[PDB]
Amino acid sequence: TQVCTGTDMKLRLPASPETHLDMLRHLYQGCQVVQGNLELTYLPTNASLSFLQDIQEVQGYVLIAHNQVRQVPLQRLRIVRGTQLFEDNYALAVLDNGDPLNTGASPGGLRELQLRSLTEILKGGVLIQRNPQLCYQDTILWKDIFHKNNQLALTLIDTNRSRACHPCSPMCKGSRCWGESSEDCQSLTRTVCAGGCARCKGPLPTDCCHEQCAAGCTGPKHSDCLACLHFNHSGICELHCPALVTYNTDTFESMPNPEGRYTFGASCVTACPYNYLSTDVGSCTLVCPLHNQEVTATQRCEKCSKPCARVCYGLGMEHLREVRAVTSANIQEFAGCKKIFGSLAFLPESFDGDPTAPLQPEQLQVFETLEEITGYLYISAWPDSLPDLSVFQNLQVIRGRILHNGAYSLTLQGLGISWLGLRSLRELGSGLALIHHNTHLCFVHTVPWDQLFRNPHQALLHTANRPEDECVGEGLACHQLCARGHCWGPGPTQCVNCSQFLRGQECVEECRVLQGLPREYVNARHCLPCHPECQPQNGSVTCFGPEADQCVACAHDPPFCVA
Amino acid sequence: TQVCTGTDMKLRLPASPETHLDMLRHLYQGCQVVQGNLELTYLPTNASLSFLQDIQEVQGYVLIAHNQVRQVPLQRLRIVRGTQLFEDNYALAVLDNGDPLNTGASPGGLRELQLRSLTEILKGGVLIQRNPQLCYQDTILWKDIFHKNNQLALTLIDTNRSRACHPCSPMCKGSRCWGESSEDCQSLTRTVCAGGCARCKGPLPTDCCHEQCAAGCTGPKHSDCLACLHFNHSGICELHCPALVTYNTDTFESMPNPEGRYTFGASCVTACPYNYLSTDVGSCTLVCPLHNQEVTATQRCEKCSKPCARVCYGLGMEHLREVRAVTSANIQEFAGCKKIFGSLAFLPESFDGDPTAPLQPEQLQVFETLEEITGYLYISAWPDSLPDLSVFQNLQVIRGRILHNGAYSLTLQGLGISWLGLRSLRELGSGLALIHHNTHLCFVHTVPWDQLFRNPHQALLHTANRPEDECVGEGLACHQLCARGHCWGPGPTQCVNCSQFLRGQECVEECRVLQGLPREYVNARHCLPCHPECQPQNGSVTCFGPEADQCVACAHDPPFCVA
Amino acid sequence: GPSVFLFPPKPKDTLMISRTPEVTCVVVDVSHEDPEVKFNWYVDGVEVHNAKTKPREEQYNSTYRVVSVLTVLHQDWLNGKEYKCKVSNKALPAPIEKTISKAKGQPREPQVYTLPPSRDEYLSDSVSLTCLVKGFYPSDIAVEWESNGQPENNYKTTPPVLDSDGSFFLYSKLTVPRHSETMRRWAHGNVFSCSVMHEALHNHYTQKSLSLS
Amino acid sequence: GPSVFLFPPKPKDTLMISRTPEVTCVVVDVSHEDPEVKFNWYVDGVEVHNAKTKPREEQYNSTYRVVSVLTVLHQDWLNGKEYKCKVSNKALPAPIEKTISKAKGQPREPQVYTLPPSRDEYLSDSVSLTCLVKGFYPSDIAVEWESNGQPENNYKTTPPVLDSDGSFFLYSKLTVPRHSETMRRWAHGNVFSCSVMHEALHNHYTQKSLSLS
Ligand SMILES: *[C@@H]1O[C@H](CO)[C@@H](O[C@@H]2O[C@H](CO)[C@@H](O[C@@H]3O[C@H](CO[C@H]4O[C@H](CO)[C@@H](O)[C@H](O)[C@@H]4O)[C@@H](O)[C@H](O[C@H]4O[C@H](CO)[C@@H](O)[C@H](O)[C@@H]4O)[C@@H]3O)[C@H](O)[C@H]2NC(C)=O)[C@H](O)[C@H]1NC(C)=O
Ligand SMILES: *[C@@H]1O[C@H](CO)[C@@H](O[C@@H]2O[C@H](CO)[C@@H](O[C@@H]3O[C@H](CO[C@H]4O[C@H](CO)[C@@H](O)[C@H](O)[C@@H]4O)[C@@H](O)[C@H](O[C@H]4O[C@H](CO)[C@@H](O)[C@H](O)[C@@H]4O)[C@@H]3O)[C@H](O)[C@H]2NC(C)=O)[C@H](O)[C@H]1NC(C)=O
Ligand SMILES: *[C@@H]1O[C@H](CO)[C@@H](O[C@@H]2O[C@H](CO)[C@@H](O[C@@H]3O[C@H](CO)[C@@H](O)[C@H](O[C@H]4O[C@H](CO)[C@@H](O)[C@H](O)[C@@H]4O)[C@@H]3O)[C@H](O)[C@H]2NC(C)=O)[C@H](O)[C@H]1NC(C)=O
Ligand SMILES: *[C@@H]1O[C@H](CO)[C@@H](O[C@@H]2O[C@H](CO)[C@@H](O[C@@H]3O[C@H](CO)[C@@H](O)[C@H](O[C@H]4O[C@H](CO)[C@@H](O)[C@H](O)[C@@H]4O)[C@@H]3O)[C@H](O)[C@H]2NC(C)=O)[C@H](O)[C@H]1NC(C)=O
Ligand SMILES: *[C@@H]1O[C@H](CO)[C@@H](O)[C@H](O)[C@H]1NC(C)=O
Ligand SMILES: *[C@@H]1O[C@H](CO)[C@@H](O)[C@H](O)[C@H]1NC(C)=O
Ligand SMILES: *[C@@H]1O[C@H](CO)[C@@H](O)[C@H](O)[C@H]1NC(C)=O
Ligand SMILES: *[C@@H]1O[C@H](CO)[C@@H](O)[C@H](O)[C@H]1NC(C)=O
């Protein structure tokens, strides 16, 4: 849990508020490093945010907006690298956060930042607008927190308030505090160092931190850093992980390096985390570099010796990189795709115009060949005509290397669906599942969602669907033959684990060995057809296999047959 | 034998005279219809030509040139269609045929044509030059023999002689005879008919022949013809065979026709002869029409639904249609070809220049992937460096749909070879084999040539190779393990039928089941390697198959293994 | 005069704890005129007085058949104790004594191998599932069948046979009739299992599985 | 007193023409004191006077063993004639008569099926080629092995067993030792052949082939 993904829902009204709270809980619970963006939004006053306590690093930006809650426990937060930036400018964004309308007692809104450990902001600036009740946001001197580089990064702080603030604690330096208490005294690790030192634990030369340290240090060495400016290689802070190969000097033949490591965020690692891709250049990534091809061995990227075999690109990738949804203009592009390198979104505009034409229920059948989605699946609109999603009935894996709003690999909201059709789905590689406000959707608690997840931070968030009680009434349940009572839908086709035998898609209790209309044979709990030229056998098996050389008797060829 | 192929060696000095005589014998023996050209050339005085007696039709042209023999028994010859024409002009060509140099008695040269039945020459003219001793070649009135169409076809008759001729028999019409006897009276079946009749058996209206008859008839019907002008459909002479399909009238959906037949030369047939190709347009042919693709079912041509898969074209086809031989300019074109749609010739210029560069012995290795040659193989030159033709050691079939000089599918003359390397060859689809004047070539009578042929007219013509006696001395013979003592060469690799077991190319008496250095398993008298992760078993078999799930024990996986 | 025949306990009883093995002493040709038969049982020479006796069982040839049953301990039989039955009757000039015991010799562990039917056997009216039991000692052995954990009882086992080496071997033949329920389980690939119970087996039990292809 | 035991002809001899079958009458426990034994042979009640007699074969327990051999005709044995041996000795209060014959009942044709060894048997020190002979009658049957047309003689056949239906069944077990020549022929896939000879077989012979995979 040391590492969790962030989000990318920047400032957009979350769909369901209950799930938004639980989502943040499941996500940042015990998380120490946010690979992504820390986005705390639309949180009510009576909300608990204790799971945020252990966050130390945020690779992306930090956005605290539209919250009635009064404080956010981010005391351990030391560094914000700001690889992404809010509105392409800010690493820290504190916006709004105040009562807009009507008792009990107390007021609404953020009060103190209390970013006690935050002593580094590598790339990015600060934005603090509105936030009545916000105090001590002008006492900081951010250019100690801003790194030597990208110092010009903007600062834009509004100091409007609806209340006055006490002075800082008398234990702090004048105008140096994150809050009125003593524990909120601003720590200063730059512009108070000996000589050209970007970071230090004091004004002395001996107090200066190592070149590779960020935010601060406990000593002069590269092992005493508080956070590594570039990469954490087994406790040491370095500029780059050891390459996977070292080249010959006289020739330039590549030789494998035992000391080689892969870059994962700001960490050198012996192997890439699950669902990430390994590359020859020594980096863990969620998309292969250009000119490379995805292949297993253990998923990995290899550069193409011959033409990179053509693959299907979904939304958020290549020519569809900036396309919102699947529409009549792109639906054909997925003709006979087994695997889509991208995402799939279905919005109300998919089934409406944009002088484009509205989509139709038959066109969606194109996806019946789809087995894997690298990105995510999002369905906010779907025809009333169709009862389920059996268009996607052969989808096995939604890897989630991309996630809707940075969080949800699978999303299903506001549909007239009556059950899920995804009988082949076995893995949600990453991200959460959000299924809510599907007035008629039954067969949710019938799915063993536990099976589909692969990491702790994953979970299903469901609410406002048709009540499980209401579904039991009307007599809806898994078919007799669905083992462990796990099923995606009503009929025998929708079983998860087939108790008896599988005739293609139907889960049936009797294959047609011994006197079936077209004779059959079993093979790993699958019914399969005996070769037609095999002769039907009365009370005995008809064949051992599919071919004509496996018959018991023939229709008319030393092993084969030829009626 | 009713049908034989002709030749296309027009006027070129045959390589070996003995084989040329035997070749004509094997070819036209019992032949009644020459699909091709009747070419009688360089025949000596003491030569027998009785096999020609039954020839009735010649589809191509007739060339009688450079012969010391005194007559050619072509009395039954009725028609010469002349689809091909000698020098692009003549259906009948009689050239030279006379003593050029120094006893016994008698002179050399042709005497009388005696084409008693020849009453039709559809397309073509006549050429008779020189031929001292040729008599009665100006008494014919050829425009009775020439059909109504292509009548303008040329006539060019030299009447030089070295002797005088008697008058025709008094039983013939004045100046109407093929010879001084009565049996050589010219039959006249045109310009002596009632009205606009192209053919007839008399001057009366009732004597006129049917429209479809050629040469003559025995009555007015289309069953009384002597030869069909276009096609012989089960005894009836018609203009075109019944199509394989008949089209719907309201739609135009094709419906299979039971009465449908294929065109084979001038004959409607229920199925195409062996080695010929069947087409959808209802024709037997040796090359598919353009836009079509060769495929079996029973070889057949099908029009390409998708792009016609790229295939390899040999000499006599497409861009190589007019290329004499394989040279440095084209050798690369056969890179990794399994099947060549064309021919392959290797002439002394292949290994010499033409300011092109000479070919080298290593370049020939390109053909080690070649399995099938549609056309023919001809080798008049080959490097002294190489001992055999094991470059072609994976060639299985030389179909012979094209033939060198119209006769020889396989030719091997004037080489420093010491044995044939063609260990994979099983079929000479058509045409003769000619292997002569290979001073060092042994291992000829070791080959069971009988096996390789597919029709009566085929045979091997061998002469002037290293004597079988001389080969026995020096101790050359098939390896111990060559079953039935059939082999293409010395070593164990060159066995035809392997007595014991095959380790790739070697024929060996012991596979490595039970304690071989790399353990093995048998499969249809082939030694094959056990999966490496299988554990070597001492005195017991190591595996049942190639995979890792067929081991007896493993190296380190419910059925599989993983040392 | 009468004739005695002494049978050992069933091998399954010997090895399973909650099954009671018993040495059984049969008496046949007990005369109509002299039916009074008397039994004395001995273990390693020592009388028992524990066994019980079934009543007179009259037979087709107008003779009685008296059977004495001595229930035995698992340890005593497995450790090779001699069980001796002394029958006494008026028609016998002298009493008959018969001694049974465990086979005395080197114990050896069986190897169990299941073979499926040959392709050709399927045309017939029944297919045979074969269970080879090889290289064991002594001959006392119990072999059962079962599919999906349920005993099957169409099987016929041969008598143990002496191998060239000295150990014993046998075969068992589970008949799977045409149209049979046991056939449907076979063609559907359900697990058929050949259970074996023998002394030298660790835990006195091993069973081999078998299914189609 | 002595004891007599009468054996039939070998089934192979009965069916093959150029092999002479012979009914064999053994006499054991012939006293040292009274060795004079006399034989009378009878076919369907009629004396023969054709048989011959092997000499006294002295045994370990100081007794003689006299064996009388009566060579029989193929037709007579196959048509069910009774062969009766009347032994006579001084130690016998009355002479002993023993009658052998063909088994009397419905004749049925065997079905021969060859099974290969199980994968697991290959780890052991020998693999077993199994030849099932099923549903035949009577029990007189001869079973051999051979590979590449050459007899193999490491095989052990069970005694015929009564099936639930009445017909007989048995198995045969050709042992192929580790490192054996018969093993190399097996692993190379050479043809192993289980020959069977039985009355009801057409031509009194059928043989099934068997090879690896
Ligand atoms: C009058 O009626 C009675 C009642 O039927 C007959 O009694 C039979 O006598 C024969 C004598 O040969 C007995 O045969 C013996 O069978 C033994 C095993 O079979 C029994 O045991 C099993 C297991 O419990 C039962 O399932 C089965 O049904 C039988 O009850 C064999 O082991 C014996 O062989 C031993 O003795 C011979 C002879 O010395 C030795 O050579 C062998 O090596 C071996 O050690 C024996 O064959 C038969 O069991 C008796 N019937 C019953 C019901 O027990 C009388 O025979 C009959 N009339 C006459 C004149 O005897
Ligand atoms: C003194 O020494 C002699 C010599 O060895 C012993 O004689 C043996 O006596 C036993 C008596 O039980 C005989 O056993 C019988 O064996 C028969 C088959 O085995 C022989 O035949 C085959 C084929 O030719 C030979 O290959 C084999 O080596 C044997 O020679 C069985 O068929 C008999 O069973 C029949 O009788 C019993 C008893 O009535 C019935 O219950 C059965 O149902 C069946 O019908 C029998 O078991 C043995 O064969 C004799 N030896 C020889 C060499 O023949 C004496 O036993 C020994 N001392 C004493 C006290 O006997
Ligand atoms: C850069 O990475 C390094 C490590 O790669 C990191 O330094 C320290 O690494 C060690 C382990 O390598 C961490 O120690 C662990 O901390 C966790 C708490 O998060 C504990 O659960 C671990 O086990 C303890 O508890 C067990 C149960 O009682 C005991 O049995 C066991 O002995 C342990 O006591 C273990 O303590 C350590 O937390 C980090 N960090 C520090 C400051 O030591 C470094 O922080 C990374 N970042 C940089 C250098 O900027
Ligand atoms: C156009 O084709 C037709 C036939 O498709 C052809 O007409 C005649 O066809 C028949 C058979 O269809 C031919 O008759 C055969 O001739 C051969 C000799 O080449 C014989 O071997 C045949 O068998 C005879 O001998 C057997 C053994 O004694 C007998 O048992 C048997 O009964 C036969 O007698 C058989 O006779 C016939 O030769 C041709 N031709 C003629 C003139 O009849 C026709 O010639 C073709 N060409 C045209 C129409 O221009
Ligand atoms: C308060 O906010 C308003 C608008 O947000 C701004 O114009 C004003 O300058 C702010 N007051 C002070 C004292 O900065
Ligand atoms: C199959 O067996 C049943 C047994 O009741 C019989 O009635 C039926 O005719 C048999 N069918 C065939 C095709 O043999
Ligand atoms: C004889 O032949 C020569 C040349 O071939 C030719 O010029 C001459 O005209 C011929 N003679 C006659 C009489 O045609
Ligand atoms: C194989 O068997 C031979 C028998 O002579 C033995 O010497 C050898 O050590 C064995 N090898 C292995 C690897 O078991």
Tab-separated table of C-alpha atoms in Angstrom, chain A residues 229-404:
chain	number	residue	atom	x	y	z
A	229	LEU	CA	15.172	14.553	-5.827
A	230	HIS	CA	15.161	11.938	-8.605
A	231	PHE	CA	15.301	8.258	-7.634
A	232	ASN	CA	15.425	6.115	-4.481
A	233	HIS	CA	17.905	3.297	-5.169
A	234	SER	CA	17.818	1.037	-2.109
A	235	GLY	CA	17.933	3.832	0.462
A	236	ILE	CA	20.375	5.995	-1.533
A	237	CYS	CA	19.256	9.032	-3.534
A	238	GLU	CA	20.720	9.013	-7.054
A	239	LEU	CA	20.246	10.818	-10.361
A	240	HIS	CA	19.400	7.724	-12.428
A	241	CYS	CA	18.957	4.023	-11.755
A	242	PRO	CA	21.683	1.654	-12.989
A	243	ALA	CA	21.119	0.739	-16.620
A	244	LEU	CA	20.057	-2.790	-17.515
A	245	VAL	CA	23.127	-3.215	-19.757
A	246	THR	CA	26.667	-1.907	-20.047
A	247	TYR	CA	28.231	-1.573	-23.485
A	248	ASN	CA	31.508	-3.032	-24.678
A	249	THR	CA	34.284	-0.479	-25.109
A	250	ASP	CA	36.065	-1.730	-28.242
A	251	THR	CA	32.868	-3.059	-29.806
A	252	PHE	CA	29.512	-1.808	-28.540
A	253	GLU	CA	27.850	-5.151	-27.844
A	254	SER	CA	25.383	-4.868	-24.966
A	255	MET	CA	26.120	-6.920	-21.848
A	256	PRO	CA	23.441	-7.543	-19.183
A	257	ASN	CA	24.084	-5.685	-15.939
A	258	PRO	CA	23.231	-7.445	-12.650
A	259	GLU	CA	23.083	-4.057	-10.910
A	260	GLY	CA	20.522	-2.870	-13.464
A	261	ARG	CA	17.151	-1.658	-12.228
A	262	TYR	CA	13.900	-0.223	-13.570
A	263	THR	CA	12.511	3.250	-12.904
A	264	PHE	CA	9.106	3.182	-11.201
A	265	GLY	CA	8.042	6.735	-10.444
A	266	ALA	CA	10.869	8.036	-8.272
A	267	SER	CA	12.088	4.594	-7.198
A	268	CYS	CA	14.599	2.106	-8.579
A	269	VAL	CA	13.085	-1.382	-8.428
A	270	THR	CA	14.160	-4.926	-9.277
A	271	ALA	CA	10.949	-5.572	-11.237
A	272	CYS	CA	7.914	-3.646	-12.380
A	273	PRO	CA	4.709	-3.700	-10.292
A	274	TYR	CA	1.812	-5.810	-11.496
A	275	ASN	CA	-0.133	-4.410	-14.471
A	276	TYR	CA	2.817	-2.156	-15.390
A	277	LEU	CA	4.959	-2.772	-18.473
A	278	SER	CA	8.690	-3.478	-18.551
A	279	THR	CA	10.815	-1.863	-21.259
A	280	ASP	CA	14.294	-2.408	-22.665
A	281	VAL	CA	15.285	1.147	-21.675
A	282	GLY	CA	14.698	0.194	-18.033
A	283	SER	CA	11.400	1.865	-17.161
A	284	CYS	CA	8.046	0.759	-15.800
A	285	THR	CA	5.200	2.334	-17.763
A	286	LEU	CA	1.515	1.903	-18.561
A	287	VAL	CA	1.971	2.428	-22.322
A	288	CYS	CA	4.878	1.188	-24.397
A	289	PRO	CA	7.130	3.828	-25.971
A	290	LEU	CA	6.598	4.611	-29.626
A	291	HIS	CA	7.992	2.007	-32.062
A	292	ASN	CA	7.470	-0.703	-29.396
A	293	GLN	CA	5.070	-3.639	-29.201
A	294	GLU	CA	3.370	-5.225	-26.199
A	295	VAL	CA	4.138	-8.919	-25.672
A	296	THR	CA	4.223	-11.313	-22.728
A	297	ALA	CA	7.005	-13.548	-21.413
A	298	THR	CA	5.079	-11.381	-17.812
A	299	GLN	CA	3.928	-8.463	-19.959
A	300	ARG	CA	6.715	-6.413	-21.534
A	301	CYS	CA	7.508	-4.018	-24.378
A	302	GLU	CA	9.761	-4.970	-27.298
A	303	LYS	CA	10.852	-2.775	-30.191
A	304	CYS	CA	9.491	-4.016	-33.504
A	305	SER	CA	11.970	-5.918	-35.668
A	306	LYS	CA	9.459	-6.008	-38.552
A	307	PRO	CA	6.419	-3.706	-38.982
A	308	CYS	CA	4.679	-3.227	-35.638
A	309	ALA	CA	1.598	-5.411	-36.105
A	310	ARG	CA	-1.497	-3.230	-36.393
A	311	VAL	CA	-3.535	-3.000	-33.181
A	312	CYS	CA	-6.772	-1.306	-32.155
A	313	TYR	CA	-6.560	2.059	-30.378
A	314	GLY	CA	-9.396	3.079	-28.076
A	315	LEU	CA	-10.282	6.461	-26.657
A	316	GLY	CA	-7.442	8.402	-25.081
A	317	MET	CA	-4.912	7.037	-27.577
A	318	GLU	CA	-3.537	8.140	-30.956
A	319	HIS	CA	-6.156	9.560	-33.334
A	320	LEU	CA	-8.730	9.052	-30.555
A	321	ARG	CA	-6.567	10.706	-27.890
A	322	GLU	CA	-8.898	13.714	-27.631
A	323	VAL	CA	-12.191	11.925	-28.418
A	324	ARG	CA	-14.768	12.016	-25.624
A	325	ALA	CA	-16.860	8.957	-26.446
A	326	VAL	CA	-17.771	6.238	-28.916
A	327	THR	CA	-20.033	7.689	-31.608
A	328	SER	CA	-21.206	6.864	-35.122
A	329	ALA	CA	-17.985	8.478	-36.386
A	330	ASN	CA	-15.728	5.899	-34.693
A	331	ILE	CA	-17.873	2.832	-33.925
A	332	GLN	CA	-16.725	1.056	-37.093
A	333	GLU	CA	-13.062	1.492	-36.140
A	334	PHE	CA	-13.362	-1.428	-33.688
A	335	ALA	CA	-14.472	-3.955	-36.319
A	336	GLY	CA	-13.303	-7.370	-35.152
A	337	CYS	CA	-10.927	-6.081	-32.474
A	338	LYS	CA	-9.833	-8.642	-29.895
A	339	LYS	CA	-7.802	-6.172	-27.811
A	340	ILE	CA	-8.202	-2.386	-27.643
A	341	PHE	CA	-5.200	-0.283	-26.601
A	342	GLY	CA	-7.176	2.502	-24.979
A	343	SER	CA	-10.490	3.178	-23.284
A	344	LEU	CA	-14.178	2.933	-24.149
A	345	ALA	CA	-16.756	5.513	-23.064
A	346	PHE	CA	-20.478	5.605	-23.880
A	347	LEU	CA	-22.074	8.975	-23.149
A	348	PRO	CA	-25.588	10.260	-23.946
A	349	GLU	CA	-24.097	11.990	-26.999
A	350	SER	CA	-23.058	8.566	-28.294
A	351	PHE	CA	-26.788	7.977	-28.853
A	352	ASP	CA	-27.487	11.545	-30.009
A	353	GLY	CA	-26.310	13.888	-32.738
A	354	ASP	CA	-23.804	16.699	-33.206
A	355	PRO	CA	-24.274	18.196	-36.735
A	356	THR	CA	-22.481	13.409	-36.406
A	357	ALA	CA	-25.415	10.998	-36.260
A	358	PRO	CA	-26.775	9.126	-33.221
A	359	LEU	CA	-25.587	5.599	-32.532
A	360	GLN	CA	-27.949	2.643	-32.913
A	361	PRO	CA	-28.369	-0.520	-30.810
A	362	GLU	CA	-27.228	-2.927	-33.531
A	363	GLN	CA	-23.946	-1.104	-34.177
A	364	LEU	CA	-22.730	-1.993	-30.680
A	365	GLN	CA	-22.562	-5.680	-31.643
A	366	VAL	CA	-19.113	-4.843	-33.067
A	367	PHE	CA	-17.601	-5.430	-29.623
A	368	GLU	CA	-18.686	-9.076	-29.352
A	369	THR	CA	-15.136	-9.994	-30.425
A	370	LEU	CA	-13.513	-7.779	-27.770
A	371	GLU	CA	-11.557	-9.726	-25.143
A	372	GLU	CA	-9.375	-7.099	-23.439
A	373	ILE	CA	-9.508	-3.360	-22.744
A	374	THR	CA	-6.209	-1.827	-21.636
A	375	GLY	CA	-7.833	1.404	-20.486
A	376	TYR	CA	-11.246	1.646	-18.857
A	377	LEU	CA	-14.937	1.099	-19.531
A	378	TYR	CA	-17.403	3.907	-18.810
A	379	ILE	CA	-21.117	3.725	-19.645
A	380	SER	CA	-23.281	6.705	-18.661
A	381	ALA	CA	-25.842	6.013	-21.404
A	382	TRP	CA	-27.104	2.876	-23.121
A	383	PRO	CA	-30.217	2.106	-25.196
A	384	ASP	CA	-33.398	1.208	-23.349
A	385	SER	CA	-33.814	-1.404	-26.090
A	386	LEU	CA	-30.887	-3.513	-24.917
A	387	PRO	CA	-31.386	-5.250	-21.543
A	388	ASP	CA	-27.748	-5.924	-20.663
A	389	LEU	CA	-24.161	-5.512	-21.889
A	390	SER	CA	-23.855	-8.902	-23.599
A	391	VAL	CA	-22.343	-6.924	-26.476
A	392	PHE	CA	-19.273	-7.179	-24.212
A	393	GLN	CA	-19.970	-10.824	-23.347
A	394	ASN	CA	-16.471	-11.976	-24.376
A	395	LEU	CA	-14.531	-9.269	-22.506
A	396	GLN	CA	-12.114	-10.984	-20.107
A	397	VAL	CA	-9.818	-8.231	-18.784
A	398	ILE	CA	-10.202	-4.500	-18.181
A	399	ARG	CA	-6.620	-3.779	-17.197
A	400	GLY	CA	-7.221	-0.217	-16.029
A	401	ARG	CA	-3.839	1.172	-17.079
A	402	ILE	CA	-6.021	4.203	-17.781
A	403	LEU	CA	-8.900	5.053	-15.446
A	404	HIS	CA	-11.942	7.274	-15.812
